[PDB]
mmCIF file of N, CA and C in Angstrom:
data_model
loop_
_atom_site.group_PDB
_atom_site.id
_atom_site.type_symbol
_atom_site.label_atom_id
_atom_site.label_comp_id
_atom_site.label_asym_id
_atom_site.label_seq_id
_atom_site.Cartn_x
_atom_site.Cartn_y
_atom_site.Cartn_z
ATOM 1 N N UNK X 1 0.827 -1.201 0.000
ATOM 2 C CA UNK X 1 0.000 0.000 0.000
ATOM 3 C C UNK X 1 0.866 1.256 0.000
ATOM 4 N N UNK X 2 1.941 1.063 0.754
ATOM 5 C CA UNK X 2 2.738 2.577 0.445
ATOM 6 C C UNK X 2 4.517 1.743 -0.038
ATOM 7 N N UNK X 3 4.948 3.305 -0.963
ATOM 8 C CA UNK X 3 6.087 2.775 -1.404
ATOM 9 C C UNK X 3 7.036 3.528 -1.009
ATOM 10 N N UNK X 4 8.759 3.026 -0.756
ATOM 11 C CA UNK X 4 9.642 3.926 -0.438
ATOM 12 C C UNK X 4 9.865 5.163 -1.377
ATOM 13 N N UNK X 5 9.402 4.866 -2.558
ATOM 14 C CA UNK X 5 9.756 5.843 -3.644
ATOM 15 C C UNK X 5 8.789 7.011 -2.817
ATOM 16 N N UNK X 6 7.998 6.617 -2.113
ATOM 17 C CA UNK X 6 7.459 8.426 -1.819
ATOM 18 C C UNK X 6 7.977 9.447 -0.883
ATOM 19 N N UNK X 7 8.977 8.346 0.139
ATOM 20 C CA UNK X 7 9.893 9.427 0.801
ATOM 21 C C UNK X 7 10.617 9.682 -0.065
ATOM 22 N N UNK X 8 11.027 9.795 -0.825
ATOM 23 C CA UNK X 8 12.021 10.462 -2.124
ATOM 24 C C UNK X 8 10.797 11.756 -2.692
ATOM 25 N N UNK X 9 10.036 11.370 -2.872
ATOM 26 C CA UNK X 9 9.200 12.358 -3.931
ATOM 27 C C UNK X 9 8.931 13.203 -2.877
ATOM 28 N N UNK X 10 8.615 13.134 -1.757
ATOM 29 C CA UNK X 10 7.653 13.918 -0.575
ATOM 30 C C UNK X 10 9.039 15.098 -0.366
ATOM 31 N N UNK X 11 9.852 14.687 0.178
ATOM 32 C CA UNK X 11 11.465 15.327 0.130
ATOM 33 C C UNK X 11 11.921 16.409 -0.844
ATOM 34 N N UNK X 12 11.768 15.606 -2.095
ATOM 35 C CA UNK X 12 11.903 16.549 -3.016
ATOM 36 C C UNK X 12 10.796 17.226 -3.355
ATOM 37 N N UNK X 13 9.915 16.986 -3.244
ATOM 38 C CA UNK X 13 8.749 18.254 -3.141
ATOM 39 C C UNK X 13 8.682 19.630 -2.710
ATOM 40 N N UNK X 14 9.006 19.034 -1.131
ATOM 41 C CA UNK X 14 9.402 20.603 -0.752
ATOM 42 C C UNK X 14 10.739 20.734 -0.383
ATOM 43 N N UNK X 15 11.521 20.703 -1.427
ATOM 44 C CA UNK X 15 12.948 21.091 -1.879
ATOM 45 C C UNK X 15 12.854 22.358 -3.226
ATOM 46 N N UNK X 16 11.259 21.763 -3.802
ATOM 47 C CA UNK X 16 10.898 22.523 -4.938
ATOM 48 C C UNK X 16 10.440 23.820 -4.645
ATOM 49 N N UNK X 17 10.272 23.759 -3.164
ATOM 50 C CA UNK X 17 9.221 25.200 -2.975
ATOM 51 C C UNK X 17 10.791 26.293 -2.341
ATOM 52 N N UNK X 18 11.811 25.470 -2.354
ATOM 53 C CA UNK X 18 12.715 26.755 -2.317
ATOM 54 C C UNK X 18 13.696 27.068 -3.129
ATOM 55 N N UNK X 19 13.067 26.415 -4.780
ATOM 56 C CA UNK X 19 13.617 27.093 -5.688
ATOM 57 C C UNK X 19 13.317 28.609 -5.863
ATOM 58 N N UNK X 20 14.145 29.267 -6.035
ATOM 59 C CA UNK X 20 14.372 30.467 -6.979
ATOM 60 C C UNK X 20 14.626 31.136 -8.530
ATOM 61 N N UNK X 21 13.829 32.080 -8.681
ATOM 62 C CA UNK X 21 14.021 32.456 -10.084
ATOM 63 C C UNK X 21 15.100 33.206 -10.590
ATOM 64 N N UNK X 22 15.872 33.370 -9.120
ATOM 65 C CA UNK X 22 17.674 34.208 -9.572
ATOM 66 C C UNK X 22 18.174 33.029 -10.067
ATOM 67 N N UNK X 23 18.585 31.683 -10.094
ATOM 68 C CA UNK X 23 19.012 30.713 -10.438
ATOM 69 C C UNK X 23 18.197 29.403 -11.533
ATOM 70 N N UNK X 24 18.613 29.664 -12.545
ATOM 71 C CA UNK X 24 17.985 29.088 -14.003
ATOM 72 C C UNK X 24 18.286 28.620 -14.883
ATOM 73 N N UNK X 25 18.101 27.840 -15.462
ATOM 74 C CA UNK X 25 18.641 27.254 -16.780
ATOM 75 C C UNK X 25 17.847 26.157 -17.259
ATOM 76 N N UNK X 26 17.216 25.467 -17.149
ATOM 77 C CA UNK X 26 16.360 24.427 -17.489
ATOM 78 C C UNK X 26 14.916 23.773 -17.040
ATOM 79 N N UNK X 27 14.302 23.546 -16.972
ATOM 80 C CA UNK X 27 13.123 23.207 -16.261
ATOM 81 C C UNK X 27 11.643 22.405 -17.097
ATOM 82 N N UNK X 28 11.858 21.004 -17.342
ATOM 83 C CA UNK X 28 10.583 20.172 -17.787
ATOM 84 C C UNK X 28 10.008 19.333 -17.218
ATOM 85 N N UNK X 29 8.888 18.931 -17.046
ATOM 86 C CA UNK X 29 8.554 17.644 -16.759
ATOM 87 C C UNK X 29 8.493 16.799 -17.261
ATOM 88 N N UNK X 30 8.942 15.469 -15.692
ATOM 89 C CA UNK X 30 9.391 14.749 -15.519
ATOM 90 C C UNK X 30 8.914 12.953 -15.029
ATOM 91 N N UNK X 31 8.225 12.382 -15.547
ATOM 92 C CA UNK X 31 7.408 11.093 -15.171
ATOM 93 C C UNK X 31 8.538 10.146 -14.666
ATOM 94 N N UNK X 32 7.977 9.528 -13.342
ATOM 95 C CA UNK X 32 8.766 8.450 -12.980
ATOM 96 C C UNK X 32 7.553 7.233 -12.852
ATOM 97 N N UNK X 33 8.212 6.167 -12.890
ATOM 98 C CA UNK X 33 7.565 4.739 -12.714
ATOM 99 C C UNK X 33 8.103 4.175 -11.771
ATOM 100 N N UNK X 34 7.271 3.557 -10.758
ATOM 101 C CA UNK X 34 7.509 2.801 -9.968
ATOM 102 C C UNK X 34 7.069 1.051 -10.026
ATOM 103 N N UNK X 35 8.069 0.307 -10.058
ATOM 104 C CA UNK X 35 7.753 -1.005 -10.539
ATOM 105 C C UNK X 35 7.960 -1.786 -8.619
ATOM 106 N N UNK X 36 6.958 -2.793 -8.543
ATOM 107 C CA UNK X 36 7.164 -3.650 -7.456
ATOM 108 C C UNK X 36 8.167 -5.051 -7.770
ATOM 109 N N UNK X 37 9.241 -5.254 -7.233
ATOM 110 C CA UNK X 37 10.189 -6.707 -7.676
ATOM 111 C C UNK X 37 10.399 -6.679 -9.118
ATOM 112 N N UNK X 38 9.772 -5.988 -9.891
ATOM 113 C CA UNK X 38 10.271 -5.879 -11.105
ATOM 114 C C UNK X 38 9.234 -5.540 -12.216
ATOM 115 N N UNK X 39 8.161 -5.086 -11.878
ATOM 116 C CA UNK X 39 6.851 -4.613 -12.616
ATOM 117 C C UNK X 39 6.640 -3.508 -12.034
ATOM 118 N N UNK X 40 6.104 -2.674 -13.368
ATOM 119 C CA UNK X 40 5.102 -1.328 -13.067
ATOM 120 C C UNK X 40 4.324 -1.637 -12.065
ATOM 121 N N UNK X 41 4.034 -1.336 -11.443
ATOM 122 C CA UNK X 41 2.370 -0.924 -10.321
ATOM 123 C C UNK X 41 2.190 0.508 -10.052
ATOM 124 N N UNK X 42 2.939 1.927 -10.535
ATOM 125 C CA UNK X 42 2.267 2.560 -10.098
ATOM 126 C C UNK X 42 3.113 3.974 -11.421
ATOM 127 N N UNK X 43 2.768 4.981 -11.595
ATOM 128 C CA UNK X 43 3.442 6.060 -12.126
ATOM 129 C C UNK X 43 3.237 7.512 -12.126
ATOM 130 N N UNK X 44 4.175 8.259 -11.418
ATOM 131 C CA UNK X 44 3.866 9.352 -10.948
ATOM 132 C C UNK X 44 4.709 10.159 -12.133
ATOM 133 N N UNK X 45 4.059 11.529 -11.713
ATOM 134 C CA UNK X 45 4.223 12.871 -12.686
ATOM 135 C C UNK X 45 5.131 13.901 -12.013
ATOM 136 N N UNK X 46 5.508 14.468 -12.356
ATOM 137 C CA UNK X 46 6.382 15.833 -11.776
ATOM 138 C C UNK X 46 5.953 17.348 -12.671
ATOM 139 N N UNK X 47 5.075 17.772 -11.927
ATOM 140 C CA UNK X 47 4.560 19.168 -12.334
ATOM 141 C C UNK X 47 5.551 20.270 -11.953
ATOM 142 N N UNK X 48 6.267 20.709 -13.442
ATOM 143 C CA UNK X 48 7.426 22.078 -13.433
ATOM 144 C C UNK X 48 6.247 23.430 -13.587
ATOM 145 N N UNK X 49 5.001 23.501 -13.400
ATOM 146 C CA UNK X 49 4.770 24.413 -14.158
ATOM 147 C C UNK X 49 3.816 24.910 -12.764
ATOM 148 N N UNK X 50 3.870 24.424 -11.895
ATOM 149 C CA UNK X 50 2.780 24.518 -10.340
ATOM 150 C C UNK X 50 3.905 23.954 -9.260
ATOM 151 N N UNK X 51 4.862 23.598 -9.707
ATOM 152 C CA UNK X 51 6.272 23.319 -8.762
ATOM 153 C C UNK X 51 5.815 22.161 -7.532
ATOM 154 N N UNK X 52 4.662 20.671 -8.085
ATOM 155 C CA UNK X 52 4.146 20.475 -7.548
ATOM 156 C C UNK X 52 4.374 18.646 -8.008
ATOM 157 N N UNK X 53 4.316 17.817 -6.839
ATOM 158 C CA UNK X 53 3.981 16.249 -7.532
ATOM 159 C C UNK X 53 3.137 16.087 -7.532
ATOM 160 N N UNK X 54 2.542 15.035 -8.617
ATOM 161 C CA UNK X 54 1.241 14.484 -8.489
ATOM 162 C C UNK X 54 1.627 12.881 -8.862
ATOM 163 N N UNK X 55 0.255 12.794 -8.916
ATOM 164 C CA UNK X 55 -0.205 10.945 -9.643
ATOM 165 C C UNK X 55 -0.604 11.325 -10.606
ATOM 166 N N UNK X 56 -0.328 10.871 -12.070
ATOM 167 C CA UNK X 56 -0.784 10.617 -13.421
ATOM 168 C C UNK X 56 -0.450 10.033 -14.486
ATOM 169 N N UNK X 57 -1.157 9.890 -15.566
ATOM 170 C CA UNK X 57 -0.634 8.719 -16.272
ATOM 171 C C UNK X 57 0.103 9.728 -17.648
ATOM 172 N N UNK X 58 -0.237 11.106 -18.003
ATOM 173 C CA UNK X 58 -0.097 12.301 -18.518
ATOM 174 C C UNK X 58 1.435 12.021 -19.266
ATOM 175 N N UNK X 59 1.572 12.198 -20.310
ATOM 176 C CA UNK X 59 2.920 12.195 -21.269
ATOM 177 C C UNK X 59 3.928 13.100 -20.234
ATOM 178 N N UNK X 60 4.828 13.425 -21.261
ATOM 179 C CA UNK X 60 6.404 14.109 -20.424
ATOM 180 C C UNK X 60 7.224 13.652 -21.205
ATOM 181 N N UNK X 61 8.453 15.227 -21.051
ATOM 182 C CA UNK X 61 9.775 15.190 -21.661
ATOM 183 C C UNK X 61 10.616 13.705 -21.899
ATOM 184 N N UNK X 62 10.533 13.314 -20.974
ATOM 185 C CA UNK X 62 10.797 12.213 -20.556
ATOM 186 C C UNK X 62 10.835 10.993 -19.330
ATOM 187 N N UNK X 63 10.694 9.691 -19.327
ATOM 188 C CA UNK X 63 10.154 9.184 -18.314
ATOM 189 C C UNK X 63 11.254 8.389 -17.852
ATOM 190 N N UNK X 64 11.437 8.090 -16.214
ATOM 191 C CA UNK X 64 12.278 7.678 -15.641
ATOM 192 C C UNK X 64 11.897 6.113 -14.863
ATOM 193 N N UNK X 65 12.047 4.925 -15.389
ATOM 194 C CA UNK X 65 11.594 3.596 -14.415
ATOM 195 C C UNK X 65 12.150 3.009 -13.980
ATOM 196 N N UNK X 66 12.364 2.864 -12.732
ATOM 197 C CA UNK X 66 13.320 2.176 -12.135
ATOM 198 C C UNK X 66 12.345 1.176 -10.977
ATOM 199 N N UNK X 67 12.591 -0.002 -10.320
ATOM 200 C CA UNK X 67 12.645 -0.292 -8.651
ATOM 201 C C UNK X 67 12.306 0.335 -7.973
ATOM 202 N N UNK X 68 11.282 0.540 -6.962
ATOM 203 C CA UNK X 68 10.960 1.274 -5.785
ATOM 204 C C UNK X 68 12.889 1.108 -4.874
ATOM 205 N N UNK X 69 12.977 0.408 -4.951
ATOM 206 C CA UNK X 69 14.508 0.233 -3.699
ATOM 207 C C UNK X 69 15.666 0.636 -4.508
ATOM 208 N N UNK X 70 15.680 1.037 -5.545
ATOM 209 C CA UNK X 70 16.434 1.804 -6.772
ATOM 210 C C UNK X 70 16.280 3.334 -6.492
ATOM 211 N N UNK X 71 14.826 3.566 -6.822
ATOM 212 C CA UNK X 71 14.224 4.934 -6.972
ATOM 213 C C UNK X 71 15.085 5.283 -5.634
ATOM 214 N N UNK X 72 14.997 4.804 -4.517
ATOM 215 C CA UNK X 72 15.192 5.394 -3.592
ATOM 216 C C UNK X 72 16.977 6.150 -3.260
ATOM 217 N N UNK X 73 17.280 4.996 -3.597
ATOM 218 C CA UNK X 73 19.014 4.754 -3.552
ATOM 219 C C UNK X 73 19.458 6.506 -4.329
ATOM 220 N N UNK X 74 18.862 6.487 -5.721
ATOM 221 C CA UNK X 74 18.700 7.764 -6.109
ATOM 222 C C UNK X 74 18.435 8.670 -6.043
ATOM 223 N N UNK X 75 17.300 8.836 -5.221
ATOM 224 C CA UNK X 75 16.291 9.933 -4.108
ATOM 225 C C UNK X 75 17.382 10.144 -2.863
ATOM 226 N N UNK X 76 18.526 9.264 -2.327
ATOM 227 C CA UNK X 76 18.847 9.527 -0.950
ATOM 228 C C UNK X 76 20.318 9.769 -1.213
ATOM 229 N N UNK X 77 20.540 10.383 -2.211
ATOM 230 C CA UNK X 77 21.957 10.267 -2.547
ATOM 231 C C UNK X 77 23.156 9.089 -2.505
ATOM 232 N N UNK X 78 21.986 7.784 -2.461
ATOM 233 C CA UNK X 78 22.749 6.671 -2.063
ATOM 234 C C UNK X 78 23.832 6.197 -3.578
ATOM 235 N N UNK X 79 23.181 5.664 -4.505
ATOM 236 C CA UNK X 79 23.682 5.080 -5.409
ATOM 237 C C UNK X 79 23.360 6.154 -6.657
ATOM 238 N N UNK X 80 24.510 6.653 -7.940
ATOM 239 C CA UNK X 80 24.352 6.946 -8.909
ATOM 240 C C UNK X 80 23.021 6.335 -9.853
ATOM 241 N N UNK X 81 22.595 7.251 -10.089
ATOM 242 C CA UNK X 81 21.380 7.028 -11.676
ATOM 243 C C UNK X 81 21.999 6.393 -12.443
ATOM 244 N N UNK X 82 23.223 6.935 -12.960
ATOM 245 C CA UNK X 82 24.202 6.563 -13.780
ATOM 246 C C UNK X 82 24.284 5.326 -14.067
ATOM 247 N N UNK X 83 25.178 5.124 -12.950
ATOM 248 C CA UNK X 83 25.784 3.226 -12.471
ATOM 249 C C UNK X 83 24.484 2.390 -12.884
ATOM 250 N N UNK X 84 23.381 2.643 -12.211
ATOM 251 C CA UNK X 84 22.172 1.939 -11.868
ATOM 252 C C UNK X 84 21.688 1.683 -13.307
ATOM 253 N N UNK X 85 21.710 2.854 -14.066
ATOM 254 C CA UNK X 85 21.197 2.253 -15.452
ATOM 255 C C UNK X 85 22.292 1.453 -16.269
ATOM 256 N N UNK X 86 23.816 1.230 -15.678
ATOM 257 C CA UNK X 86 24.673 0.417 -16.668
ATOM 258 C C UNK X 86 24.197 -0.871 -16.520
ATOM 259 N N UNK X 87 23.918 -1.525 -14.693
ATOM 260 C CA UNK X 87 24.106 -2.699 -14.738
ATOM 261 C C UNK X 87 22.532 -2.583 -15.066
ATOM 262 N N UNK X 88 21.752 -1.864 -15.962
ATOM 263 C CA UNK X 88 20.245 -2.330 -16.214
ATOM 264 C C UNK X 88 19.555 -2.433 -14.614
ATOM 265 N N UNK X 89 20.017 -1.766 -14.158
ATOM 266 C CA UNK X 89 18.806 -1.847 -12.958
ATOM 267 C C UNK X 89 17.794 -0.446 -12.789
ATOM 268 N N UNK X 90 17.977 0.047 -13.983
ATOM 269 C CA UNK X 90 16.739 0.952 -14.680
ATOM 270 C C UNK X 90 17.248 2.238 -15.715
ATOM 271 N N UNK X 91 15.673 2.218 -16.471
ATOM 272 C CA UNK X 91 16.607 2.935 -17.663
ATOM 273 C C UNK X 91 15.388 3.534 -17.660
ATOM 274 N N UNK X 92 15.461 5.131 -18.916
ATOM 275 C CA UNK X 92 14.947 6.210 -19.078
ATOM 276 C C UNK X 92 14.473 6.489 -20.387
ATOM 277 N N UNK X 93 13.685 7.503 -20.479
ATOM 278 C CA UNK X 93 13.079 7.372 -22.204
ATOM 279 C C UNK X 93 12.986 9.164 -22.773
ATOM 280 N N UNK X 94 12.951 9.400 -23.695
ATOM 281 C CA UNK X 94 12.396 10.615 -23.897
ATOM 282 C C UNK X 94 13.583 11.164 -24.486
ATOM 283 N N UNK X 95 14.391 12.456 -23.781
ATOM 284 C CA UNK X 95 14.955 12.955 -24.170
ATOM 285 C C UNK X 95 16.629 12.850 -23.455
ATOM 286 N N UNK X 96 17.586 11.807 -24.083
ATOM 287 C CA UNK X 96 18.501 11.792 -23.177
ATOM 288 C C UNK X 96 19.463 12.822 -22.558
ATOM 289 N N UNK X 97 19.291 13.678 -23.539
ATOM 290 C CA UNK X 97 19.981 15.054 -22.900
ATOM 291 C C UNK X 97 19.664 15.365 -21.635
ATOM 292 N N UNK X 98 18.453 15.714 -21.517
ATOM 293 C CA UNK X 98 17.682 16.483 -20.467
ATOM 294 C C UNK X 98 17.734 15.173 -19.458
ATOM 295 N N UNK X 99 17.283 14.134 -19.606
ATOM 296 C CA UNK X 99 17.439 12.956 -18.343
ATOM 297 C C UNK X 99 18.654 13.285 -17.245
ATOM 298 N N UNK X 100 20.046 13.495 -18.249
ATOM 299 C CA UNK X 100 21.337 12.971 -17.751
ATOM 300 C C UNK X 100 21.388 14.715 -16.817
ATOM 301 N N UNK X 101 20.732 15.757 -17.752
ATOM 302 C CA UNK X 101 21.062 17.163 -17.381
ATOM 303 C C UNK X 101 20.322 17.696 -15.517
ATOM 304 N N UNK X 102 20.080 15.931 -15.444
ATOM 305 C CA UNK X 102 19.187 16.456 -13.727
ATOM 306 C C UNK X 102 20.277 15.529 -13.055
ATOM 307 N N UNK X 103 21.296 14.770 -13.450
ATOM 308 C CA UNK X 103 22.081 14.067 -12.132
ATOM 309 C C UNK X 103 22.927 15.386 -11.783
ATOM 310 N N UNK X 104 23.050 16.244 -12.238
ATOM 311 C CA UNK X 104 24.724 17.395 -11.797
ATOM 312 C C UNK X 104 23.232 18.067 -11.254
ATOM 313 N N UNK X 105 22.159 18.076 -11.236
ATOM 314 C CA UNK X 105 21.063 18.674 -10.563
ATOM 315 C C UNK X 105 20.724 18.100 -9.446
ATOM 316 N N UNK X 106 20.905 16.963 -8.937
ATOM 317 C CA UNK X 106 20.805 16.309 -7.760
ATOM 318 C C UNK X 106 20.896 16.886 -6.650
ATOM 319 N N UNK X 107 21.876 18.295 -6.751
ATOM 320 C CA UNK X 107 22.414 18.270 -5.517
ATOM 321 C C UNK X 107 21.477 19.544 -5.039
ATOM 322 N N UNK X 108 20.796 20.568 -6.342
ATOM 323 C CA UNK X 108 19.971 21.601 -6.605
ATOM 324 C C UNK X 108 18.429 21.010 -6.082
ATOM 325 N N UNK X 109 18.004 19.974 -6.903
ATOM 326 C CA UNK X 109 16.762 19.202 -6.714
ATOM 327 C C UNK X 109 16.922 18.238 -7.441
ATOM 328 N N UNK X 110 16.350 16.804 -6.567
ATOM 329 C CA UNK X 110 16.173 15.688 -7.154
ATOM 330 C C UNK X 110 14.729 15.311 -7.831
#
């Protein structure tokens, strides 16, 4: 009923509310998937335009699916995105520029 991936999202949520508009350069949304042991069960949205998360099934720049116990590792500064997508323990779709252009953002907002 609840997943670790939402202490990651809840965190970075309001990490979002103390962005600033002196500091800029990029900004799209962002869909992540959350799979249980190795399947989808659930997929959330990242609203750039209301600085807000939600639940939806709604297109995007690009989409991010990984492991709930993945998602997290990534959410907690534990384990690289990077690494995680070599050994295939999750991969990304859309636009690879912009995917890779949020890990040096990690440290800004995850």
């Amino acid at each position: 009923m609840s997943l670790k991936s939402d202490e990651v999202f809840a965190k970075i949520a309001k990490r979002l509310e103390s962005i600033d508009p002196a500091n800029r350069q990029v900004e799209h949304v962002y869909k992540f998937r959350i799979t249980q042991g190795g399947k989808v069960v659930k997929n959330w949205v990242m609203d750039l335009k209301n600085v807000k998360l939600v639940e939806s099934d709604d297109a995007a720049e690009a989409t991010l699916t990984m492991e709930d116990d993945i998602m997290f590792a990534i959410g907690t500064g534990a384990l690289p995105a990077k690494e995680a997508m070599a050994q295939d323990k999750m991969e990304v779709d859309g636009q690879v520029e912009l995917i890779f252009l949020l890990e040096p953002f990690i440290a800004s907002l995850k």
